Amino acid sequence: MSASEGEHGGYKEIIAKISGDGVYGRLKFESGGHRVQRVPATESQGRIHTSACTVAVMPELPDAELPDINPADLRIDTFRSSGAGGQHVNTTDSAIRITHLPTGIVVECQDERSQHKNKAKALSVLGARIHAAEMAKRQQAEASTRRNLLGSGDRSDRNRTYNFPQGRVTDHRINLTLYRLDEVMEGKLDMLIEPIIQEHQADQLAALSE
Amino acid sequence: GNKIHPIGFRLGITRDWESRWYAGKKQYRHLLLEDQRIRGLLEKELYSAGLARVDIERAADNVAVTVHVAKPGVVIGRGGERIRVLREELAKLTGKNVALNVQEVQNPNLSAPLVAQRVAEQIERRFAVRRAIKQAVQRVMESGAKGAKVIVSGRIGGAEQARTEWAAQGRVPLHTLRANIDYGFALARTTYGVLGVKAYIFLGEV
Amino acid sequence: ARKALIEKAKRTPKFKVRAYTRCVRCGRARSVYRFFGLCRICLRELAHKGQLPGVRKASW
RNA sequence: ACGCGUUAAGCGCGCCGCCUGGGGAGUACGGCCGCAAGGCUGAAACUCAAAGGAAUUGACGGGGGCCCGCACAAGCGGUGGAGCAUGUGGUUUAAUUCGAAGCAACGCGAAGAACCUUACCAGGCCUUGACAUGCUAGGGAACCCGGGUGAAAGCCUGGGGUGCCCCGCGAGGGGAGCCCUAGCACAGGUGCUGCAUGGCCGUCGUCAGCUCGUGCCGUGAGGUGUUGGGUUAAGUCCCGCAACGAGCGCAACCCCCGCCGUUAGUUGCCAGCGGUUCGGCCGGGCACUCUAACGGGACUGCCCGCGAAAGCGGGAGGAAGGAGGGGACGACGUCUGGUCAGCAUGGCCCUUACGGCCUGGGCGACACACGUGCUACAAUGCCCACUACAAAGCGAUGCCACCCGGCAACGGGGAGCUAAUCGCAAAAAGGUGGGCCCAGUUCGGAUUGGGGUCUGCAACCCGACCCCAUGAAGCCGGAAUCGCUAGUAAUCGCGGAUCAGC
RNA sequence: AAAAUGUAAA
RNA sequence: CGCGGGGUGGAGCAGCCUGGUAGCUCGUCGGGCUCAUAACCCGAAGGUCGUCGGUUCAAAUCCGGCCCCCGCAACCA
Ligand SMILES: [Mg+2]
Ligand SMILES: [Mg+2]
Ligand SMILES: [Mg+2]
Ligand SMILES: [Mg+2]
Ligand SMILES: [Mg+2]
Ligand SMILES: [Mg+2]
Ligand SMILES: [Mg+2]
Ligand SMILES: [Mg+2]
Ligand SMILES: [Mg+2]
Ligand SMILES: [Mg+2]
Ligand SMILES: [Mg+2]
Ligand SMILES: [Mg+2]
Ligand SMILES: [Mg+2]
Ligand SMILES: [Mg+2]
Ligand SMILES: [Mg+2]
Ligand SMILES: [Mg+2]
Ligand SMILES: [Mg+2]
Ligand SMILES: [Mg+2]
Ligand SMILES: [Mg+2]
Ligand SMILES: [Mg+2]
Ligand SMILES: [Mg+2]
Ligand SMILES: [Mg+2]
Ligand SMILES: [Mg+2]
Ligand SMILES: [Mg+2]
Ligand SMILES: [Mg+2]
Ligand SMILES: [Mg+2]
Ligand SMILES: [Mg+2]
Ligand SMILES: [Mg+2]
Ligand SMILES: [Mg+2]
Ligand SMILES: [Mg+2]
Ligand SMILES: [Mg+2]
Ligand SMILES: [Mg+2]
Ligand SMILES: [Mg+2]
Ligand SMILES: [Mg+2]
Ligand SMILES: [Mg+2]
Ligand SMILES: [Mg+2]
Ligand SMILES: [Mg+2]
Ligand SMILES: [Mg+2]
Ligand SMILES: [Mg+2]
Ligand SMILES: [Mg+2]
Ligand SMILES: [Mg+2]
Ligand SMILES: [Mg+2]
Ligand SMILES: [Mg+2]
Ligand SMILES: [Mg+2]
Ligand SMILES: [Mg+2]
Ligand SMILES: [Mg+2]
Ligand SMILES: [Mg+2]
Ligand SMILES: [Mg+2]
Ligand SMILES: [Mg+2]
Ligand SMILES: [Mg+2]
Ligand SMILES: [Mg+2]
Ligand SMILES: [Mg+2]
Ligand SMILES: [Mg+2]
Ligand SMILES: [Mg+2]
Ligand SMILES: [Mg+2]
Ligand SMILES: [Mg+2]
Ligand SMILES: [Mg+2]
Ligand SMILES: [Mg+2]
Ligand SMILES: [Mg+2]
Ligand SMILES: [Mg+2]
Ligand SMILES: [Mg+2]
Ligand SMILES: [Mg+2]
Ligand SMILES: [Mg+2]
Ligand SMILES: [Mg+2]
Ligand SMILES: [Mg+2]
Ligand SMILES: [Mg+2]
Ligand SMILES: [Mg+2]
Ligand SMILES: [Mg+2]
Ligand SMILES: [Mg+2]
Ligand SMILES: [Mg+2]
Ligand SMILES: [Mg+2]
Ligand SMILES: [Mg+2]
Ligand SMILES: [Mg+2]
Ligand SMILES: [Mg+2]
Ligand SMILES: [Mg+2]
Ligand SMILES: [Mg+2]
Ligand SMILES: [Mg+2]
Ligand SMILES: [Mg+2]
Ligand SMILES: [Mg+2]
Ligand SMILES: [Mg+2]
Ligand SMILES: [Mg+2]
Ligand SMILES: [Mg+2]
Ligand SMILES: [Mg+2]
Ligand SMILES: [Mg+2]
Ligand SMILES: [Mg+2]
Ligand SMILES: [Mg+2]
Ligand SMILES: [Mg+2]
Ligand SMILES: [Mg+2]
Ligand SMILES: [Mg+2]
Ligand SMILES: [Mg+2]
Ligand SMILES: [Mg+2]
Ligand SMILES: [Mg+2]
Ligand SMILES: [Mg+2]
Ligand SMILES: [Mg+2]
Ligand SMILES: [Mg+2]
Ligand SMILES: [Mg+2]
Ligand SMILES: [Mg+2]
Ligand SMILES: [Mg+2]
Ligand SMILES: [Mg+2]
Ligand SMILES: [Mg+2]
Ligand SMILES: [Mg+2]
Ligand SMILES: [Mg+2]
Ligand SMILES: [Mg+2]
Ligand SMILES: [Mg+2]
Ligand SMILES: [Mg+2]
Ligand SMILES: [Mg+2]
Ligand SMILES: [Mg+2]
Ligand SMILES: [Mg+2]
Ligand SMILES: [Mg+2]
Ligand SMILES: [Mg+2]
Ligand SMILES: [Mg+2]
Ligand SMILES: [Mg+2]
Numbered sequence A: 001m002s003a004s005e006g007e008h009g010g011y012k013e014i015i016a017k018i019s020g021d022g023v024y025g026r027l028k029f030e031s032g033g034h035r036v037q038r039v040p041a042t043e044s045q046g047r048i049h050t051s052a053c054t055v056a057v058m059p060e061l062p063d064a065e066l067p068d069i070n071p072a073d074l075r076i077d078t079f080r081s082s083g084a085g086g087q088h089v090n091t092t093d094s095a096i097r098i099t100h101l102p103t104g105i106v107v108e109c110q111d112e113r114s115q116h117k118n119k120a121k122a123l124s125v126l127g128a129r130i131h132a133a134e135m136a137k138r139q140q141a142e143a144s145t146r147r148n149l150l151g152s153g154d155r156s157d158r159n160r161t162y163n164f165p166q167g168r169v170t171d172h173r174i175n176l177t178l179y180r181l182d183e184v185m186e187g188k189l190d191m192l193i194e195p196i197i198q199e200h201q202a203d204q205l206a207a208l209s210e
Numbered sequence B: 001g002n003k004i005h006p007i008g009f010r011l012g013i014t015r016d017w018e019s020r021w022y023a024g025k026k027q028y029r030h031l032l033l034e035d036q037r038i039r040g041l042l043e044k045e046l047y048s049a050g051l052a053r054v055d056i057e058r059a060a061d062n063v064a065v066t067v068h069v070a071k072p073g074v075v076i077g078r079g080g081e082r083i084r085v086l087r088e089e090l091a092k093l094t095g096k097n098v099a100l101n102v103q104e105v106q107n108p109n110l111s112a113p114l115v116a117q118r119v120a121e122q123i124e125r126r127f128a129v130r131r132a133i134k135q136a137v138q139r140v141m142e143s144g145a146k147g148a149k150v151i152v153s154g155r156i157g158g159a160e161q162a163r164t165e166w167a168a169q170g171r172v173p174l175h176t177l178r179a180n181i182d183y184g185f186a187l188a189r190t191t192y193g194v195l196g197v198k199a200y201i202f203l204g205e206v
Numbered sequence C: 001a002r003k004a005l006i007e008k009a010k011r012t013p014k015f016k017v018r019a020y021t022r023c024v025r026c027g028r029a030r031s032v033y034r035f036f037g038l039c040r041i042c043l044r045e046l047a048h049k050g051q052l053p054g055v056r057k058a059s060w
Numbered sequence D: 001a002c003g004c005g006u007u008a009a010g011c012g013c014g015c016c017g018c019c020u021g022g023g024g025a026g027u028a029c030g031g032c033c034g035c036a037a038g039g040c041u042g043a044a045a046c047u048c049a050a051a052g053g054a055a056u057u058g059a060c061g062g063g064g065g066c067c068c069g070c071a072c073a074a075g076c077g078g079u080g081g082a083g084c085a086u087g088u089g090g091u092u093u094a095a096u097u098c099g100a101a102g103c104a105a106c107g108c109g110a111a112g113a114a115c116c117u118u119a120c121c122a123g124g125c126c127u128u129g130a131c132a133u134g135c136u137a138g139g140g141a142a143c144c145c146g147g148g149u150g151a152a153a154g155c156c157u158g159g160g161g162u163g164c165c166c167c168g169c170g171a172g173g174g175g176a177g178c179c180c181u182a183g184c185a186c187a188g189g190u191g192c193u194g195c196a197u198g199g200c201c202g203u204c205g206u207c208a209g210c211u212c213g214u215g216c217c218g219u220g221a222g223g224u225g226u227u228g229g230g231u232u233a234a235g236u237c238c239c240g241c242a243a244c245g246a247g248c249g250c251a252a253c254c255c256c257c258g259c260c261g262u263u264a265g266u267u268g269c270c271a272g273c274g275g276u277u278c279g280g281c282c283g284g285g286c287a288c289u290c291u292a293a294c295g296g297g298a299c300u301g302c303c304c305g306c307g308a309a310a311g312c313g314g315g316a317g318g319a320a321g322g323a324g325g326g327g328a329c330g331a332c333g334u335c336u337g338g339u340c341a342g343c344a345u346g347g348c349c350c351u352u353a354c355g356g357c358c359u360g361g362g363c364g365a366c367a368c369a370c371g372u373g374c375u376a377c378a379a380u381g382c383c384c385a386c387u388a389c390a391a392a393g394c395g396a397u398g399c400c401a402c403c404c405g406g407c408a409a410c411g412g413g414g415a416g417c418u419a420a421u422c423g424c425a426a427a428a429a430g431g432u433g434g435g436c437c438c439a440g441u442u443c444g445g446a447u448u449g450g451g452g453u454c455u456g457c458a459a460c461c462c463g464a465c466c467c468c469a470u471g472a473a474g475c476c477g478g479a480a481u482c483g484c485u486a487g488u489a490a491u492c493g494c495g496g497a498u499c500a501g502c
Numbered sequence E: 001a002a003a004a005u006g007u008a009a010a
Numbered sequence F: 001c002g003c004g005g006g007g008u009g010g011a012g013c014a015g016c017c018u019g020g021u022a023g024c025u026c027g028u029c030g031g032g033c034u035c036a037u038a039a040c041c042c043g044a045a046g047g048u049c050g051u052c053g054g055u056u057c058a059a060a061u062c063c064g065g066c067c068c069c070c071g072c073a074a075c076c077a
Helices: A023-030 A115-150 A181-185 A190-205 B028-045 B082-094 B112-124 B129-142 C003-010 C040-049
Strands: A002-004 A013-015 A032-038 A049-055 A075-079 A095-099 A106-109 A160-163 A168-171 B051-058 B063-069 B102-104 B147-154 B163-170 B181-190 B193-202
Touching: A023 A190, A095 A115, A106 A115, A160 A181, A168 A181, A168 A190, A181 A190, B028 B051, B028 B063, B028 B082, B051 B112, B063 B082, B112 B129, B112 B147, B112 B181, B112 B193, B129 B147, B129 B163, B129 B193, B147 B181
Parallel strands: A032 A160, B063 B102
Antiparallel strands: A002 A013, A032 A049, A075 A095, A095 A106, A160 A168, B051 B063, B147 B163, B147 B193, B181 B193
């Protein structure tokens, strides 16, 4: 869905929705940094280099903006508008103030001479403002859950190493270190992701039973 | 890496085959296969002798292995007892009527295959490679040679970084056919890898 | 697969077609000049060495 | 150090001004000036382990001068486009074994993948092993024959010989050997690391370069020599020179070709004669051709011009002339180049398995991309008939004459040759004759149908070959790109290595 | 007159 | 609520007046150059025209409704 290619080669960023069965169950353990040691394709001379990439896997979550407002959780005030209008502006409660109770957010509108023309506008703005307020909440939740998962730093931020010269891949968490990297690069991840699943499940017994 | 073998380049020019016999076509590939096995036991047993060249001749059926050594005594033994069991093991494996033969090497400091051994042996015994090249190139030069040069490749001194290391005096016109030169290889086995030893001895043109 | 396979080569087979010629020195199966029973590399060395009778550096 | 040197940057004295690591910073604050722009005075925190001066040696330049290479240019033929062959990327798969990566990976390791090869895959298997050196305990005897189940490997299992050594009157006894069933040392690994290595190779480059000794210059790195003028393919020589020499390179010494000669005369050859069954075929002969071993030949020696020399430009005589053509030969080094999978090898790891055997599959997959190739698009062409002229190689586990059968691939018979005897062998472009008529054709030969031959235990995956039929894209190829300077390119066939066959 | 760029470990 | 404009390949705009026919620049994909990337050169793919109806032999094009976007208007008290 997004893919910022870094000239040659990659992907300076790529994002994918992996749909299926047991996806977040198995692909959960990739959240963190991945170190690579190899002679880079970009190398002028013949020096071995260390690099890293960050992976975040957030599960596919449900999401639904509330059915607009519902007048039950709302206080509406009516009153006289301020400024021009003559006879009519003084004897006519044409100003609206709708107070959305669950958030305390308030709009007022004394734009037009019609009270419901203003209630309409004040219901329009209040809508956009509670939506925009929840979107932002849901934003800096997603945007800050990644900050942790993704692991800001690099070269030294966690998880596992892929050494091409020695052919070893190794997970630093379970301290597993099987050096059949060829297959792992071909997607044969299970001889890696299954050890973590068991070791993590041994931290579940010893957790409320130890 | 690109230089030719000095012997291979001077066949029939300043150098003769270390095996001299005819063979039609039907039996060449086992005359030789045996021939090769002959230098097998010979080099293996006569290390102590300092064997410089094996000249295998073949008459009617019968073999005729001549052998050149620095110190001949090792080969012969008390009352010539090793030299007999020698030609014994030979006909025991060849199945063909054999031939003992030994002529010594007059000046051991003029046979590259000898020099190479003595070098590679030294570094097998943790001797300073650099100052031992100049030593060998001295003796070979001081022993009358018209030219001399020794080369050592591999992890010198046990160093992680392998390297070439050589010295030379006099001439070594390797391009010149008219020149006679002696070549000599040796392999220094070590607790830290393997180092190749090469010798060049220029014994004047002709 | 090395010394075990050089041994299959020596064994008289089950069918004549399964014959293959190995090197009589290094043990290579591919590129095998039959005149010597040698491989193309073993050949080259001994040739330079002068331990192969009569054969010399060609030139014309 | 560069340089300065009575116009000091020398040797001295007098006085003023100024500096005290780089960045922060000529910034901030304060003060003084200014219309303003701004100026004078002028910090600190913080941060770095350097900043910097000259000089040396390289490399580099969209710097210079002099040269050079199929580098451009001048030319002929090509790839890129088409169908096929093959190598690679990729994707795919149980596996599509591994390595190679711009030049210098990609018809490369592979100079022979159906099984074998085979390192991968699924599966049935074996555990001191397929191999080496030994050490054990029931300890039988070699080695031929067999049952058995099975896809084989394997696992189970039935008869024998009436062996051998010491020598015992003897009914048996202990030796050795190989095999035997367990056990222990150990074997084994194409498992990793070419960035721990040897060896060998690629490459800059057949480019003319790279250095040492001593001396001399410089505080030193270093310089001088190697530079300079001439000359050369060349650090090739010449002359010059605070340098004098030397080594590895260049050249020569080696092979092949072109000319002549000496030696040699069959299985080669045939010029004059003899026999002619009009055939080197018999007699006969070594002259020529040939074959193959030793020589001769070329030296800028000769002539003109120039030159200080080296030599350069021309001339002649010569088979050949200034290196006659071709090959063999690859400096100090550079690329952390290639290869641990040809072999070697330090360290690391696997141990009823990361070792071993077998059967079958795969390395030949196919939405795609590339490298190298083959065959074409036709008339300077294509088909059929006939008829000529080659060099190099191979072959008594082989090459096959020639009759016979077959449209053929080939098969059956069968002569000769271990071969300058005999054979593969037909050379093909060529020449002569006939046909084709500018057509998607008598161009083209991919695709596929049918029917067969040979090698192999076996051609489904997966072979080459033959016959009938089928008769695709292709009308000369976008951007772009390759080779070659003389017996070269283009074109035409022949042979060989590997190898049952391909 | 053409013609930008080459991160980070020996 | 009123009036005017608009929705066409991933982005940005033509074509509608006058019915038949889909264009431009960019991006993208494949092949070149280059040691490599870009610039540059060659070749290609990509929309079924907001959404429902209707007119017509035929609708991006003409007509009605709806949805989303844009500009204007909303005065006298
Ligand atoms: Mg690079
Ligand atoms: Mg890093
Ligand atoms: Mg919602
Ligand atoms: Mg609400
Ligand atoms: Mg109220
Ligand atoms: Mg007011
Ligand atoms: Mg009122
Ligand atoms: Mg009222
Ligand atoms: Mg009222
Ligand atoms: Mg108002
Ligand atoms: Mg880490
Ligand atoms: Mg690697
Ligand atoms: Mg590691
Ligand atoms: Mg699982
Ligand atoms: Mg080198
Ligand atoms: Mg070479
Ligand atoms: Mg040499
Ligand atoms: Mg010795
Ligand atoms: Mg075979
Ligand atoms: Mg001075
Ligand atoms: Mg003066
Ligand atoms: Mg003055
Ligand atoms: Mg002045
Ligand atoms: Mg003065
Ligand atoms: Mg002073
Ligand atoms: Mg100071
Ligand atoms: Mg400071
Ligand atoms: Mg100032
Ligand atoms: Mg200023
Ligand atoms: Mg202050
Ligand atoms: Mg101030
Ligand atoms: Mg002022
Ligand atoms: Mg003013
Ligand atoms: Mg002013
Ligand atoms: Mg101002
Ligand atoms: Mg200003
Ligand atoms: Mg060129
Ligand atoms: Mg050209
Ligand atoms: Mg490729
Ligand atoms: Mg490997
Ligand atoms: Mg059986
Ligand atoms: Mg072991
Ligand atoms: Mg490594
Ligand atoms: Mg090496
Ligand atoms: Mg290379
Ligand atoms: Mg040259
Ligand atoms: Mg060359
Ligand atoms: Mg000096
Ligand atoms: Mg100086
Ligand atoms: Mg010289
Ligand atoms: Mg001069
Ligand atoms: Mg006639
Ligand atoms: Mg006569
Ligand atoms: Mg005569
Ligand atoms: Mg004669
Ligand atoms: Mg001659
Ligand atoms: Mg003069
Ligand atoms: Mg002339
Ligand atoms: Mg010549
Ligand atoms: Mg010529
Ligand atoms: Mg030459
Ligand atoms: Mg290195
Ligand atoms: Mg290294
Ligand atoms: Mg290296
Ligand atoms: Mg075990
Ligand atoms: Mg005719
Ligand atoms: Mg004719
Ligand atoms: Mg010839
Ligand atoms: Mg043949
Ligand atoms: Mg043969
Ligand atoms: Mg046979
Ligand atoms: Mg045959
Ligand atoms: Mg016939
Ligand atoms: Mg007939
Ligand atoms: Mg017939
Ligand atoms: Mg017929
Ligand atoms: Mg026949
Ligand atoms: Mg017959
Ligand atoms: Mg016969
Ligand atoms: Mg013809
Ligand atoms: Mg057509
Ligand atoms: Mg068929
Ligand atoms: Mg058969
Ligand atoms: Mg087609
Ligand atoms: Mg045409
Ligand atoms: Mg046309
Ligand atoms: Mg035509
Ligand atoms: Mg010519
Ligand atoms: Mg840039
Ligand atoms: Mg930049
Ligand atoms: Mg770079
Ligand atoms: Mg260094
Ligand atoms: Mg308008
Ligand atoms: Mg209008
Ligand atoms: Mg408008
Ligand atoms: Mg509108
Ligand atoms: Mg509209
Ligand atoms: Mg439109
Ligand atoms: Mg758009
Ligand atoms: Mg417009
Ligand atoms: Mg419209
Ligand atoms: Mg209009
Ligand atoms: Mg492109
Ligand atoms: Mg580019
Ligand atoms: Mg319609
Ligand atoms: Mg239309
Ligand atoms: Mg419609
Ligand atoms: Mg429309
Ligand atoms: Mg509408
Ligand atoms: Mg208003
Ligand atoms: Mg008004
Ligand atoms: Mg009024």
